[PDB]
Amino acid sequence: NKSDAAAKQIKKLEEDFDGRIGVFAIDTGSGNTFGYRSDERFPLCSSFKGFLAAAVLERVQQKKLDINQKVKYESRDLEYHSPITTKYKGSGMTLGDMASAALQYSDNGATNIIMERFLGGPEGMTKFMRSIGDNEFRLDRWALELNTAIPGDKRDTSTPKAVANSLNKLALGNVLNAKVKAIYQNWLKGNTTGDARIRASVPADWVVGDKTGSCGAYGTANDYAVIWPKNRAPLIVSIYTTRKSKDDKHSDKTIAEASRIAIQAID
Amino acid sequence: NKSDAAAKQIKKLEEDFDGRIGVFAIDTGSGNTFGYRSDERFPLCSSFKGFLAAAVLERVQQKKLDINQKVKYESRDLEYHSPITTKYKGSGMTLGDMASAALQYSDNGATNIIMERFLGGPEGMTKFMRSIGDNEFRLDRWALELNTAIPGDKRDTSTPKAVANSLNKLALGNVLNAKVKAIYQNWLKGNTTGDARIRASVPADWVVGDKTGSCGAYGTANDYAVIWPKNRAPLIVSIYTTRKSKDDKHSDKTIAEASRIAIQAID
Ligand SMILES: *C(=O)[C@@H](NC(=O)/C(=N\OCC)c1nsc(NP(=O)(O)O)n1)[C@@H]1NC(C(=O)O)=C(Sc2nc(-c3cc[n+](C)cc3)cs2)CS1
Ligand SMILES: *C(=O)[C@H](NC(=O)/C(=N/OCC)c1nsc(NP(=O)(O)O)n1)[C@@H]1NC(C(=O)O)=C(Sc2nc(-c3cc[n+](C)cc3)cs2)CS1
Ligand SMILES: [Cl-]
Ligand SMILES: [Cl-]
Ligand SMILES: [Cl-]
Ligand SMILES: [Cl-]
Ligand SMILES: [Cl-]
Ligand SMILES: [Cl-]
Ligand SMILES: [Cl-]
Ligand SMILES: [Cl-]
Ligand SMILES: [Cl-]
Ligand SMILES: [Cl-]
Ligand SMILES: [Cl-]
Ligand SMILES: [Cl-]
Ligand SMILES: [Cl-]
Ligand SMILES: [Cl-]
Ligand SMILES: [Cl-]
Ligand SMILES: [Cl-]
Ligand code: NA
């Protein structure tokens, strides 16, 4: 009856900005959840990089790769939005730095390099997610092409709930061992791109790890986070948005507001 | 406290048969490892043919060779223990069949022929392994000469850990593409020489792919395997053994027992 209220405010927010909002949120201390369109598909945009970095750390743990192995790509032309990979291009990067770059700055060259050499492309990235029991997620395209966000299109999408479930598995569950999870968590905590999204919805003295996506068409953007409040157990929050026209800008405030509503609801 | 125990059992087994046992094992599902003498050198014996097979499939993937190209050797005197190459000698074999034969029956002529025409000799075979980041392994002689297994001699040796690492890279990693890997895995699954070694250490309904070697001096024999349990992730097990006196026979039961101990330990 007050979880119907939260759904009502999400409705009004989607109506206000003429688009579609999907939310899932879990309070891991109590198990209360809140969903709105939590089983509908949204474009992932850059948000899959947060899982991609998890996959790299999993192959480190499986001893297939070394976190300090050097990765050299002097010959490569770098994708648009490659801030870190551009500045390291003379000297190569460690695997760990390239992986955190893909996550903490949404670096496209970093993503594509890791996917081509280590993960088996978008198919391998999808298979990774199947392996932790995520049945929704699908990655079909490489980093620059998967941000088209065309209404009705199911390529490169998941659901809010599935992103939440997977983040909860990787950041708080048992896919990664204690040491490798701590690195994953720290990677998420140092993300640089999410200050106006889920982070903006919470008190400054809480600790937030997140990954954003911004498709740059159809006002499509998203954010997922693990949240550590003071003296309580972790929350998981996952917000996906799209808008009607190709030319619509995304809305960070709509995300932060949906996040705020979702946190109240799981409380 | 229970990983020291596993080391203790390996000790007793080496003392029991008066020789030296080297073990490395990975559980890819958890990343737990187990080593005993895992950084000591042991003779490879025929066990390098499993990597030689991988090398051939890599040049197939590079389209340097065709898997169905005919390989003709009417002119040649065959090495001792060439069961498959002897039976095809009149008509030649496909590259792929020669390669699988080298692996599944430990065919010496097949090995030597491939190394002499396609892989650039013991030097080329060693360089192959450097190319996947295996820095230990060295092949110095051709197929029959490398089986002398002389105590203290470092020619034609590797370490349990390095063999384990490389198998994991080749059989489960991303040196081979999805299609070519599956062939490699099938080759390994149908090995015929390994029934009394690692295979004997595991429940019948698990799937096992392996490659053995038997130097036939100094009781030196070994086996490495990729292991697929029902409803768990792959294991990698690598067991090397040596004995004191020239005339000592190898012990398949010691291998199977070391394997059994190693599997429990990574669990
Ligand atoms: C590589 O290890 C190969 N081994 C050998 O060539 C030699 N000895 O093997 C004897 C145990 C060898 N090298 S040089 C030499 N004599 P020299 O004059 O220099 O003193 N002899 C091949 N690999 C293997 C292997 O273990 O893979 C073997 S042992 C085999 N067992 C079977 C088998 C066993 C059981 N079952 C049910 C079926 C088949 C096949 S090969 C020897 S050849
Ligand atoms: C993934 O979502 C995103 N990738 C993109 O590369 C595109 N984003 O467009 C911008 C909205 C894109 N790919 S294809 C394309 N155009 P085309 O029509 O030519 O195919 N555009 C990467 N991720 C993110 C993200 O949100 O994670 C973004 S947004 C971003 N902002 C920052 C930032 C903001 C604020 N501060 C204080 C610091 C940093 C960094 S990345 C774009 S890149
Ligand atoms: Cl209003
Ligand atoms: Cl709900
Ligand atoms: Cl819902
Ligand atoms: Cl992207
Ligand atoms: Cl490491
Ligand atoms: Cl580009
Ligand atoms: Cl689908
Ligand atoms: Cl914050
Ligand atoms: Cl553009
Ligand atoms: Cl006893
Ligand atoms: Cl060791
Ligand atoms: Cl030695
Ligand atoms: Cl050496
Ligand atoms: Cl077969
Ligand atoms: Cl032995
Ligand atoms: Cl025996
Ligand atoms: Na309103």
Side-chain angles (χ1 to χ4, degrees), chain B residues 72-78 85-92:
Chain B
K72 284 221 51 79
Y73 61 90
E74 293 149 291
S75 330
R76 188 213 181 71
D77 282 286
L78 282 176
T85 54
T86 304
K87 296 169 204 79
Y88 278 78
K89 187 181 170 159
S91 64

Side-chain angles (χ1 to χ4, degrees), chain B residues 178-191:
Chain B
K179 233 206 84 213
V180 159
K181 189 161 69 170
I183 296 162
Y184 182 52
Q185 281 182 350
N186 266 313
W187 286 355
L188 282 160
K189 291 184 208 180
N191 183 47

Side-chain angles (χ1 to χ4, degrees), chain A residues 5-122 124-144 146-267:
Chain A
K8 223 87 142 181
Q9 318 180 67
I10 298 288
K11 207 179 166 282
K12 189 192 218 153
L13 215 57
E14 96 186 332
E15 283 166 348
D16 295 338
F17 93 140
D18 199 51
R20 211 160 133 260
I21 306 168
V23 172
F24 198 74
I26 311 157
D27 175 2
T28 63
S30 80
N32 308 325
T33 60
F34 171 72
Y36 178 99
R37 300 195 187 272
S38 65
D39 289 321
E40 312 188 359
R41 293 190 167 286
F42 293 77
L44 278 164
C45 321
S46 294
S47 75
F48 71 100
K49 314 159 181 183
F51 294 140
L52 166 144
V56 161
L57 280 178
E58 184 216 37
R59 317 290 209 107
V60 171
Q61 166 171 288
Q62 291 170 13
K63 281 213 71 217
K64 272 163 176 88
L65 299 184
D66 173 11
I67 210 168
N68 304 309
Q69 68 174 254
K70 194 98 316 203
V71 184
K72 291 218 47 90
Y73 57 90
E74 272 162 274
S75 314
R76 191 206 179 71
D77 270 290
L78 282 172
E79 287 74 353
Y80 174 68
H81 199 89
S82 293
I84 307 310
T85 52
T86 305
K87 69 196 27 150
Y88 275 80
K89 187 165 179 175
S91 63
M93 285 172 80
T94 66
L95 189 51
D97 283 359
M98 190 169 284
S100 56
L103 191 163
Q104 290 181 333
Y105 291 88
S106 214
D107 188 300
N108 283 318
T111 308
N112 281 341
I113 285 169
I114 283 168
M115 283 209 287
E116 77 211 11
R117 302 201 183 169
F118 303 129
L119 270 31
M125 177 74 217
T126 301
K127 284 172 70 229
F128 170 76
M129 301 295 292
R130 297 277 178 292
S131 88
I132 62 164
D134 181 335
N135 290 320
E136 307 311 316
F137 169 106
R138 49 177 317 137
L139 206 73
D140 293 290
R141 289 182 285 165
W142 296 82
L144 233 15
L146 56 70
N147 298 315
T148 50
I150 307 157
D153 179 0
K154 302 174 187 288
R155 289 175 308 175
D156 317 289
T157 65
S158 205
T159 74
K161 192 195 269 139
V163 179
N165 290 338
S166 299
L167 176 59
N168 192 190
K169 290 193 206 113
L170 292 169
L172 303 166
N174 269 8
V175 175
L176 303 174
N177 73 48
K179 182 202 90 183
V180 159
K181 182 161 75 180
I183 299 158
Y184 185 51
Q185 279 184 351
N186 287 349
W187 293 349
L188 283 151
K189 292 190 204 166
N191 183 48
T192 56
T193 74
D195 308 336
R197 306 187 185 176
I198 289 159
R199 281 188 198 262
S201 75
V202 294
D205 56 5
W206 291 18
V207 178
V208 181
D210 80 294
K211 178 83 187 90
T212 57
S214 316
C215 268
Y218 288 104
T220 295
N222 51 61
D223 198 23
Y224 69 63
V226 189
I227 308 180
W228 288 272
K230 255 271 156 33
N231 304 110
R232 303 170 66 155
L235 317 177
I236 299 279
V237 174
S238 168
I239 313 301
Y240 280 75
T241 66
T242 68
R243 281 163 56 73
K244 291 300 152 269
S245 323
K246 185 207 260 290
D247 305 303
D248 288 335
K249 308 322 127 187
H250 63 230
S251 162
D252 301 320
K253 247 81 143 204
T254 296
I255 300 166
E257 184 52 18
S259 175
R260 181 199 151 261
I261 288 147
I263 303 179
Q264 316 268 24
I266 54 73
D267 203 8

Side-chain angles (χ1 to χ4, degrees), chain B residues 4-50:
Chain B
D4 313 78
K8 221 69 149 169
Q9 309 182 42
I10 303 286
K11 209 174 182 284
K12 198 188 168 220
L13 216 59
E14 89 188 337
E15 285 170 358
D16 287 359
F17 94 142
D18 206 47
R20 210 173 137 254
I21 303 167
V23 176
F24 198 76
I26 316 166
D27 178 2
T28 62
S30 74
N32 275 31
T33 67
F34 175 74
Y36 174 102
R37 301 196 187 279
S38 68
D39 293 311
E40 309 183 15
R41 290 193 166 280
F42 290 80
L44 283 152
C45 323
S46 281
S47 72
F48 76 95
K49 309 166 179 181

Side-chain angles (χ1 to χ4, degrees), chain B residues 3-122 124-229 231-267:
Chain B
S3 169
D4 313 78
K8 221 69 149 169
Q9 309 182 42
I10 303 286
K11 209 174 182 284
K12 198 188 168 220
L13 216 59
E14 89 188 337
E15 285 170 358
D16 287 359
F17 94 142
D18 206 47
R20 210 173 137 254
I21 303 167
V23 176
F24 198 76
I26 316 166
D27 178 2
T28 62
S30 74
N32 275 31
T33 67
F34 175 74
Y36 174 102
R37 301 196 187 279
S38 68
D39 293 311
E40 309 183 15
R41 290 193 166 280
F42 290 80
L44 283 152
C45 323
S46 281
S47 72
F48 76 95
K49 309 166 179 181
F51 292 139
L52 171 142
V56 160
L57 283 172
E58 186 184 56
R59 317 286 219 109
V60 164
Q61 170 166 286
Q62 293 172 319
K63 283 168 212 175
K64 308 196 179 159
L65 304 177
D66 171 302
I67 209 163
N68 295 316
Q69 66 178 251
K70 189 102 303 206
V71 184
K72 284 221 51 79
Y73 61 90
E74 293 149 291
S75 330
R76 188 213 181 71
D77 282 286
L78 282 176
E79 286 77 357
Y80 167 67
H81 190 91
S82 294
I84 306 310
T85 54
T86 304
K87 296 169 204 79
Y88 278 78
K89 187 181 170 159
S91 64
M93 290 172 76
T94 67
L95 177 67
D97 282 359
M98 191 164 292
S100 60
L103 183 173
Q104 291 171 328
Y105 292 87
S106 211
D107 190 299
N108 280 314
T111 306
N112 278 342
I113 284 157
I114 285 168
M115 279 192 298
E116 74 210 12
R117 285 174 194 190
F118 299 130
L119 266 35
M125 172 74 214
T126 300
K127 293 189 68 129
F128 167 81
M129 301 293 297
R130 297 279 172 285
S131 86
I132 63 165
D134 180 335
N135 291 321
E136 299 290 311
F137 169 106
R138 45 178 319 136
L139 206 73
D140 291 288
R141 277 165 303 162
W142 299 83
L144 276 155
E145 295 129 353
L146 60 73
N147 285 320
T148 58
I150 308 152
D153 178 4
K154 290 174 192 297
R155 284 178 305 179
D156 316 290
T157 68
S158 204
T159 72
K161 182 184 278 120
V163 179
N165 285 342
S166 297
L167 182 58
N168 186 218
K169 294 175 183 106
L170 291 170
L172 305 164
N174 264 247
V175 172
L176 303 179
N177 74 50
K179 233 206 84 213
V180 159
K181 189 161 69 170
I183 296 162
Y184 182 52
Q185 281 182 350
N186 266 313
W187 286 355
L188 282 160
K189 291 184 208 180
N191 183 47
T192 63
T193 72
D195 287 48
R197 307 189 182 176
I198 290 160
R199 280 190 197 275
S201 75
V202 298
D205 59 1
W206 290 18
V207 173
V208 180
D210 77 295
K211 180 75 191 85
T212 56
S214 308
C215 273
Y218 292 102
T220 288
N222 50 59
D223 192 29
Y224 73 58
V226 190
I227 306 176
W228 289 271
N231 301 109
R232 291 185 74 174
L235 317 181
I236 306 276
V237 170
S238 157
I239 312 302
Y240 280 74
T241 66
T242 42
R243 280 181 66 139
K244 290 255 192 303
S245 283
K246 188 159 200 295
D247 301 303
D248 287 340
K249 278 180 84 200
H250 69 234
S251 158
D252 301 323
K253 254 89 163 177
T254 292
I255 298 168
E257 186 50 18
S259 174
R260 159 186 127 45
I261 291 148
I263 300 182
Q264 260 182 52
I266 51 77
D267 199 9

